[PDB]
Amino acid sequence: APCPHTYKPVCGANGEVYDNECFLNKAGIEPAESWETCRGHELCPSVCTEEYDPVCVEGKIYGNRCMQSHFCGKV
Amino acid sequence: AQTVPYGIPLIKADKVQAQGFKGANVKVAVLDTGIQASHPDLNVVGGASFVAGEAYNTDGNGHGTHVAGTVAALDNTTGVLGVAPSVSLYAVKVLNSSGSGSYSGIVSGIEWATTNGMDVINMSLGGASGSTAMKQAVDNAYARGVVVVAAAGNSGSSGNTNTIGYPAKYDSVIAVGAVDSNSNRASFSSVGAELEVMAPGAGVYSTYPTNTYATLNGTSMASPHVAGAAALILSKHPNLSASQVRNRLSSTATYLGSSFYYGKGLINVEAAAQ
Amino acid sequence: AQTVPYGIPLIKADKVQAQGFKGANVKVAVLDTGIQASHPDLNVVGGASFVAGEAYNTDGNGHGTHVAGTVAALDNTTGVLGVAPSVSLYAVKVLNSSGSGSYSGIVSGIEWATTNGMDVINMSLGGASGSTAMKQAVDNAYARGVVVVAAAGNSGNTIGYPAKYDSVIAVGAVDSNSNRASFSSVGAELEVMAPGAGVYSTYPTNTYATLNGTSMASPHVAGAAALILSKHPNLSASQVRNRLSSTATYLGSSFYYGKGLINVEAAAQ
Amino acid sequence: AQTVPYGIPLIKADKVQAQGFKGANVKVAVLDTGIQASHPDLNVVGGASFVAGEAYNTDGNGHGTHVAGTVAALDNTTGVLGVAPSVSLYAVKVLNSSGSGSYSGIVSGIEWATTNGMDVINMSLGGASGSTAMKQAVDNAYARGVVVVAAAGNSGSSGNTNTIGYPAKYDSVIAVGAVDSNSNRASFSSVGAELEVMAPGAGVYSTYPTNTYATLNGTSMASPHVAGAAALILSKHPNLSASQVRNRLSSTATYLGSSFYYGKGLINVEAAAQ
């Protein structure tokens, strides 16, 4: 009980995200080995506002950061 | 010390307001990141929160507050002025501080909105895929008398490609694109055949969290114009069905060109409420 | 050759250092996974260990060394730069190499700091529950004149302990744009914000790294207190604390920002 | 070691300072080439950058730093003395090191300063035309309680022709022309019907990178004198609306000649802040 407060989010096999692996373990949840198991979070959002505030990323930029992030788990 | 944003006069909501119809008694629900209730130029009268840890009367993003301002900013000695400044304003928090959410959280808000009797539903949001629980949430809301509006998306256009998002692509939901002050299409605005109408979505100025104001872009700003343009038709002709308020807004629109880009065109609140 | 993380000038700690106040002779304890003492950009002067098998001069995790860097990385031709680079730095290891600790482990750390006369405690760590011994330890540290700082937690009212104790300064995170970070906790106990997103600092094995968390924000405040005390060596724990929050730059609702972004230059006037 | 530039007593700002009002708690955004924050006689509280690759608190040009020092050079033991030396100074960078910037960047800075509750905007910049966006920004800013001041231009006069550029030419902005230490108009100072007030703009001594001082000419130098004056008014009358402040400056000005060339006259803050 008692973990470091870094935000290195991890996807629990139960469909809930934990702030880092140490919290993942305190809860007794297993890693999901699939970020899809946590759709609609932030690192993996299924929604987004429709505000236009474009971001680089590559060719298929993104209307906003949420739209860019709608591509799971990435760095 | 109160300016009228260029959106109000451009859709002619000022003409209708001048007749005394400002949307009183009409209950409009903003499904967004919440609203800054304590904002001087906003009267949030109800709502519910579907994000853990945060209430419905706070906005940690800004978006929600800036969407609701475009709808029902208090007609007073200060701030800005909304399309339907007399509306009963409800804050349904379905998004997080980052402007993101799950299909489940949105379905929840829709359902809450149907149960508590919202006259208008605004959704400045949209994923690329739909979900049957959300197509069901809206279909069961539209059929029950609730007018459902949503941003068409900011995916632009290339070729015949349909770039409309959900829940804007549903036939039971009014897909609203975005234009600028000159009535020209915002080059970021989603194209498609589900596209129904256009509205101010370029340099839109409205309320913003912690008692201030901001100028935003996107079809998210376009939506609360149509959402508010509905709250007006219902203060002047408060006996129309959801389908009548809707048919009126689209029929009496100003054609701006191809409906694959402009839909019906820029809504005319004055004409739709004649 | 030296790199100034954006967070230092953001809380305006460079301005204070420019005056000639760098935290000299201020004793700061980092209760963490330990500190890589041999790192060229860090000077560990003492500490203690409550982790079976490990001394205080190593860090098998990385977290402890990052946090310490933000507090006191050496003002150099090298690496990065801390908020209070002249500070007297102590490693108090209460978390293992996996980053986990027990309430009694953390309590031992607190008590050691109180007994050894630390001016500041940083606790970039948290739990769901508290513990009476822990509440008792922080209360007593603060009452004896220790500025106690902790990361408000990244849970996002989901503030945890020991940040949730009122004898402890609860610190949230902002980014280089002064915006609240999504992961930053919210609630009634949130006291101040500091940089916690994209924070670049010393990292174990004579290197450096960029981390995210209210764990990165906490040490900015801990360092901010060292700066204030090197300038006004005579202030009480509550004086320093109030001086940090009463001069914070307003950011918005206190539920999300507390008093807002710390400003050491103001706080140290 | 502190020098008082002649401009300060000329507008009688030295009188109002002696009354105990120095713009304390008034927020002023300098929309320019940034500011050399690390400068000894300047205190940059914050701001934003809308110039890629450049931070807001550096100044590779010198222009903005100079303008900042005229508004708020620290009243102390060195350098020069601003018109309102207790002002909360913000550096909004919308021009790069070369001195150039786009319409969108400048608009961005005006929108930011609005959102962020600045009390006063200084824009020592302009061009032959503005933009619908730039206009909407200044109107909204003015309607919010922000005194908006701009240099009128340096295109001089020739017969009947109007040489006021934007944003100065906008009516929600105070267009500021320049005079010398003799209260005579500067041959470069733009003219037109929108010219509102005059202020020192020739041989203006102020702060300059790096940690030095420089004498410049232009209406860019004049604008910040009015900007500071507005801050002084507010420090004595925190109650005043943007218009009340603005009108006080223009209707207590010392007469200097025909308004096409001198506007309503040379600002007098002592009279303005009565």
Numbering used by the authors:
A (entry chain D): 0 to 74
B (entry chain C), D (entry chain B): 1 to 274
C (entry chain A): 1 to 156, 162 to 274
Could you give the paper's own sentences about this structure?
During our recent work on subtractive ESTs (expressed sequence tags) from the Carcinoscorpius rotundicauda that was infected with Pseudomonas aeruginosa, two isoforms of the non-classical Kazal-type inhibitor, CrSPI, each of 9.3 kDa, were discovered. Earlier, we have proposed that CrSPI-1 may act as an “on-off” regulatory switch in the modulation of antimicrobial activities while maintaining homeostasis of host proteases. CrSPI-1 has been proposed to regulate the serine protease-driven antimicrobial defense during the acute phase of infection while maintaining homeostasis under normal physiological conditions.
Here, we report the crystal structure of the two-headed non-classical Kazal-type group I inhibitor CrSPI-1 in complex with its cognate protease, subtilisin, at a stoichiometric ratio of 1∶2 (CrSPI-1 to subtilisin) and refined up to 2.6 Å resolution. There were three subtilisin molecules and one CrSPI-1 molecule in the asymmetric unit. Each CrSPI-1 molecule interacted with two subtilisin molecules, i.e., domain 1 and domain 2 of CrSPI-1 interacted with two independent subtilisin molecules. The third subtilisin molecule of the asymmetric unit was not in a complex with CrSPI-1. The three subtilisin molecules of the asymmetric unit were identical with an rmsd of 0.1 Å in a pairwise superimposition of 274 Cα atoms. This indicates that there was no significant conformational change of subtilisin molecules upon complex formation with the CrSPI-1 molecule. The CrSPI-1 molecule comprises two domains: domain 1 from Cys1 to Glu40 and domain 2 from Leu41 to Leu83. Both domains adopted similar secondary structures (domain 1 β1↑β2↓α1β3↑ and domain 2 β4↑β5↓α2). The reactive site loops of both domains of CrSPI-1 occupy the substrate binding pockets of subtilisin. The reactive site loop (RSL) of domain 1 of CrSPI-1 (Cys1 to Lys6) binds at the active site region of subtilisin from P3 (Cys1) to P3′ (Lys6) in a substrate-like manner. In domain 2 of CrSPI-1, Glu49 takes the position of His3 in the P1 pocket of domain 1 and makes 8 (73%) of the 11 total hydrogen bonding contacts with subtilisin.
